[model samples]
Target: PIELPPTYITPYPEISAGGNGTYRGQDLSSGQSFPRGMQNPVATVLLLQGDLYCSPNCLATFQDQARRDSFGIQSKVALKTFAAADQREAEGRDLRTAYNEIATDIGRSQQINENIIKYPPGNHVLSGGLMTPFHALAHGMFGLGAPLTFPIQNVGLNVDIRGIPDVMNVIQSARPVGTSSLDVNFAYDVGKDSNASWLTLGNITLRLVGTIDKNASGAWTFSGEIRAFNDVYDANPSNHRGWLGENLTSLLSAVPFTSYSIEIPGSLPVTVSGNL
Candidate 1:
C-alpha cells in the first residue's frame, strides 16, 4: 500500500485560516491584517468529484498541439500526490519510476490484471482536458446570470499526454461561453519543448471553502465536507501505461495549496433570534 502524509490525506483547512492563520480575515480587533489563505478565498473549491474517462477526439487534439508548441516552451508543470506518491521533478522520470514499482506490486499481489504504467505509442496527453476542466468550471461560475450551483457541477477527466496536440484542442475548445473552440493545434519545436509548454508553475492554485449556519449572536461553525476528485486513468487499451499517470503526480505538486476552506457568505442562519 502507498503511504502519504497527514497534510496530504487529512481534510483541508478552512480558507478563512489564510496563509496567515486568521479567521475570515477578521481579527478580534480592527488593527490586524487579514491572514494569507483567508484574505481572498474563492467562492467554490474544486474536488476530484467524479470518474475520469477519455474521449479519442480529445486525445487527438492534445497530440496536435504538443507537436506544434514543443518548440519555445521551457516551463514544466508540477504534479500532486492525491493518491499515493508525491514527488517533485523537472521531468517525467520520477513519476514513470514510481508507476513501474506500483505496477510490480499490483502484479505480485494479483490485485490488478496488468501493470498500470506500460503505455502505447501514438498521439495522446497524460490526462485529457484535466488541465482545462477547472477553467471551464470557473467560467461558468463567474458568468453573467449563471447560478452559483453551476460551479459545483461534478466533473470527470480524461488524459492523453502522448497526444499533446489533442490536449491543446481540448483547451481551445474550452473557450468563453458562446465562443467556438479555437483551431490551434499543439506544435512545438523538438528542442524548445519544456515543462512550461504544458502547465506553468504557480499558474494554478486550488482552494477549499466551507459553509456554516450562523447563530443570531454571530457565532458560526463549519457545516459541510470539502472534497476533490483525484482520478488518474489510462483510457486507451493499447496505451495502458504512459506519461499521463507519471505526469499527474508532477502536475499536482506545483500548487502552493492543495485543499482548504473558507466561510460561506450567504448560507443559512442558525436562528432568527439574536440569541447565541
Candidate 2:
C-alpha cells in the first residue's frame, strides 16, 4: 500500500503549460529529399494536453487492490513512489545504517527483471516520413495517415537504454499537411544511438498547451497537441544526425496534429475552435 498526497491522485489538474525549444538536425530541403538515416530541418512534435480524465477502464484498473497489482497498476504507483524516494537525499538521512528502504528493495527486485520500467510512454520529434523513429527515454509517440475512426491511430515509440536496437517501428505510418501552425522546437539528438553517446537521454525542453471545456455530462475534457514543426529552419539539427525533421511543404500534407485528449469532471470552458 502506497500512501500519497490527494492531489497526486485527483480527477483533473489545472493543466496549462506552453513553451518553445530547439532541436539539432536536418535543415530545409535536405531533410525530405534525403533518406531515413538522413533527415533534417523543418521540425515538429504533436501531442494533445488537457483536463483529460483517465478513461473508465483506466480508472477501473487504477482503482482495485489485487486486480491492480495483477494488472501492474499497483506496482506502477509503488515503483514510482519508491524510485522517487532518492531525490530528496541529503535533505538528510538518519544513519541507522538505514538504506532508503525502496532503493534497497527495488534494487534487488530489479535484478529479477531486465526492464525495470514497465510501460514506455513519451514524446518524440517527426518531420515528414513513413514513420518516425520513436525511441524511448526508457516511449510512445503517435502518427498515421490511415486516419480512420480508429480513435487513436498509431503512436510511435521504442527505446534503447543499453543501445541495442533502440527505436520504435509502428505499423501505421504518418505524414503531415503543412499550414496553420507555428514552429517551436527544442534540443536535438544525433544519430540512432540516442541511448548513450550521452545526450540521447535527451536534450530538449518541449512545451504543452490545453483548453478546459465543460461537458453536459459533468466532465471537462482537456485537449491540445505539442507543436514543434515547420518552425523556420537551419535547425532540427544543431549540427546533423537527427531522425526526423519538420518541413513546410511535403511533411505537412497529411500530417495531422497528434491527437490525444483527457477528460475530467468540473470547471469552466474555454474553446479554441478550428484546425492546426
Candidate with top lDDT is: 1
lDDT of model number 1: 0.23
lDDT of 2 at 117: 22
Tens-digit lDDT track of model 2 for 156-226 = 11222112211111101232332122222233342242332222223322222343343343333334343
lDDT tens digits, residues 178-268, model 1? 2232222233322233332122111111222333333443433433222222222212212211333333323323322222121111111
Task: For each candidate, give its TM-score against the true structure.
Answer: 0.17, 0.17
Off by over 4 Å in 1: 1-6, 10-97, 111-276
Candidate 2: lDDT over CA atoms? 0.22
lDDT of each: 0.23, 0.22
